Structure formats: C-alpha cells, structure tokens
TrEMBL record, chain A:
Claim: Nucleotide-binding is one of the keywords in the record: no
Highest taxon above the source species: Bacteria
Section covered of the full-length record: 6 to 91 of 113
Designated name of the protein: CRISPR-associated endoribonuclease Cas2
Molecular-function GO term, any one: RNA endonuclease activity
Subunit-level organization: Homodimer, forms a heterotetramer with a Cas1 homodimer.
Organism: Streptococcus pyogenes serotype M1
E.C. number(s) listed in UniProt: 3.1.-.-
Any GO BP annotation: defense response to virus
Family as reported in the entry's similarity comment: Belongs to the CRISPR-associated endoribonuclease Cas2 protein family.
Coiled coil: none
Enzyme class: hydrolase
C-alpha cells in the first residue's frame, strides 16, 4: 500500500555555497513531487515500499554536504493530525 | 502506547540563534521530552487535556524562527525513522 513520507531538512546556511546547495536540494525535492508545508517540512505520498526504498536511496545520493534529512512514514490519520507551531 | 515525536528546526547560523536553540532544548527536556537528535525528541502521548496544556507551553516557548512539528506514531513506526547526514 501507499506510504506517506514526512521529510525534515536542515543544513548550515552561513556560506554562499551552502545556500546554493540548499536551493538545489529544495528544487530536487519539488521535482520529485514533495510539497513544502513550511520551512524545513516536506511530504510525499509514495505508492508502495519499493518506491519508498528507491526514494530513500535517491535522497541519500542528493543530500548536500552537511545536510540533515529526517524521514518518517506516517499513516494518513497521523498525517491529518499533524500539529505545526511557528515561532513569531 | 503511542509516542509523540517532536521535530524542531530553526536557522542556527548565528551564535545568538544557536543560543536560542539551546534554551529551547533545555525547556523540552524540562517538559519530559527525550532527545534523539538535535532536532528530534519524543515522549509518551499524554491524555488529551494534559496534551493541550503542553502544546500551549510549547507554543509560548518556541523561539523566533522556530518550527515545531508534532506527530504521534506507534513505537514500531517510530523505530523505522531514518536520519541521513551528508558527510
């Protein structure tokens, strides 16, 4: 069955090189069909476990220098109940 | 036996930002969250009333530019979590 992947992304961005890498990875995520819900928070519906495994490999391959990717599969009910808080 | 997972992100390029991050981390530990990574914390899911109060406290202490995501999953689902760090 389908697998909703939550993806969090964070990396240092004090250098120009880093910010370019950040923009590159974000553009990659979008081209792969992730949607950005808020800064650092993305998700994609993967069709099945095979697709999910291929995606994890792709993500590792495309992760920038110093990039940190958190991946968690959630059920649709868990996804609907997600809570987000923004600081100011 | 559900686990509440808290994921926290904020820019920490400046020393001031990293300081604010550490202050929030200290607060999370004081709220009974357990640390699993710089950005990843968990605790056993509270009853609804207590859970609402805690969410209010999290909202209040969230730094400027802070992003808090709460998800509730089973232990087995939480164990499947992946963290990828680029060399």
């Amino acid at each position: 069955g389908s697998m909703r992947m939550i993806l969090m992304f964070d990396m240092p961005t004090d250098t120009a090189e880093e910010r370019k890498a950040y923009r590159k990875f974000r553009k990659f995520l979008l081209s792969e069909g992730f949607i950005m819900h808020q800064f650092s928070i993305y998700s994609k519906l993967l069709l099945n476990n095979t697709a999910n495994n291929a995606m994890i490999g792709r993500l590792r391959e495309h992760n920038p220098n110093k990039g940190n990717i958190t991946l968690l599969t959630v059920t649709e009910k868990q996804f609907a109940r997600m809570i987000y808080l923004h600081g100011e």
